[PDB]
Amino acid sequence: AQNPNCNIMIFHPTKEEFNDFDKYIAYMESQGAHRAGLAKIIPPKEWKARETYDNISEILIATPLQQVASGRAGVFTQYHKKKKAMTVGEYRHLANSKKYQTPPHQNFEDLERKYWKNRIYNSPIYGADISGSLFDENTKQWNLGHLGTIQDLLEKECGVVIEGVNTPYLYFGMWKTTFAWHTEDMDLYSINYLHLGEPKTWYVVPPEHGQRLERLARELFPGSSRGCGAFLRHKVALISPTVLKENGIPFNRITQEAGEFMVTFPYGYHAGFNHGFNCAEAINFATPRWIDYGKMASQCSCGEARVTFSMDAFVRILQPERYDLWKRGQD
């Protein structure tokens, strides 16, 4: 078995190997990359996402989210408070202000310490989940707006044509902006490209150990757990690396820098934070190996998780027994 310790693997495809996305994902899996739950892909030196980032300031963040924490430094939840619209230019200025800017630090490790120590005492503002793309239409390789769709994959594997579309999202981040512990909708893959700015630190639990994370989370968030059998779908809970180590949960960590791709694999729980002003683009995708995960994915039916139009058909076709209860949650 390849990669039996479930370490995060880092790939350096050549320009030739960067042509066929599906084939390269399948290559990574042949080397065991999926066992970690997350891989890093460094694009060939010849490649670029677009020519420059000099003209992005007029993009609108219609609903910036202020991430307010409750709990203790290592075990907390966050809720999102809606703020007034602002442009990317306005947001970048706010990120760089004395109130929100990254503190002085020595290295990534020092910054990570400062994050876990101090995150709860501040409420950073995240521009998340903005439909759109920063890839140039002429970028042919690993263009996240031109991937094969999940609907077409389900059709190719299972023969059923379904409604729905699959498009990318932009994330504008600042110091301490946080992504809570989650897997993707329907335990899909994700791919994330850091277009510009400061790094993003990730933590991940191997898919084969995801249930260990879930059991810890039920112990650490006992009211949430009683409210919903899949409350990590709410994307509100944070657990620090110190706390995971104390409880014997297997995980790994890696820092993503500008120009790098991360791929999350089905049922790979992940969480993390942004180091400073940045912009990432991400999208879900599927492969033939996903289908079995989609069939087994947990669902939130308490009504909190409320998700895209396109998840309907996935539940309907892959989880017909669950469909009725799940749709009651959506309505």
Ligand X SMILES: O=C(O)CNC(=O)C(=O)O
Q: Which residues are annotated as a binding site for Zn(2+)?
A: 228, 234, 300, 302
Per the CB < 8 A criterion, the answer to whether 68 and 123 are in contact is yes
Residue 48 is classified by DSSP as: -
d(CA 254, CA 238): 17
Which one of Mg ion, Ni ion, ligand X, none is in contact with 278 (Cβ closer than 5 to 8 A by kind)?
none
Q: Which residues are annotated as a binding site for 2-oxoglutarate?
A: 126, 192, 200, 235
For ligand X, give the closer residue by CB, 171 or 326.
171
Locate tokens 């683009």: which residue? 281
CB of 179 to Ni ion, least distance (A): 7
Q: Which residue, 66 or 323, has its beta carbon nearer to ligand X? A: 66
77, 217 contact by CB (below 8 A): no
58 interacts with, out of Mg ion, Zn ion, ligand X, none, CB within 5 to 8 A per kind: Mg ion
Q: Are strands 237-239 and 86-87 parallel, antiparallel or unpaired?
A: unpaired
* One-letter amino acid of 200: K
Q: Please state the residue numbers annotated as binding site.
A: 126, 182, 184, 192, 200, 228, 234-235, 270, 300, 302
| Residue 171 is a binding residue for ligand X (CB under 6 A) | yes
Contacts of Ni ion in 178-237 (CB under 5 A): 190
Q: Is 58 in the site for Mg ion (CB under 5 A)?
A: yes
Alpha carbon 199 to its chain's center: 14
User: Which residues sit at the interface with Zn ion, rule CB under 5 A?
Assistant: 228, 300, 302, 304
Q: Does 193 bind ligand X (CB under 6 A)?
A: no
Greatest distance between any 2 Cα atoms in the chain: 55
Q: Is position 278 an interface residue for ligand X (rule: CB under 6 A)?
A: no
Angle at 222 between CA 71 and CA 241, to 5 degrees: 55
Nearest to 179 by CA among 200, 155, 199: 200
Rule CB under 5 A: say whether 54 interacts with Mg ion: no
Cβ–Cβ < 8 Å for 275, 93: no
Shortest spacing between CB 145 and Zn ion, in angstroms: 31
Q: What is the binding site for ligand X (CB under 6 A)? A: 171, 179, 190, 192, 264, 270, 280, 282
Binding interface with Mg ion (CB under 5 A):
56, 58-59
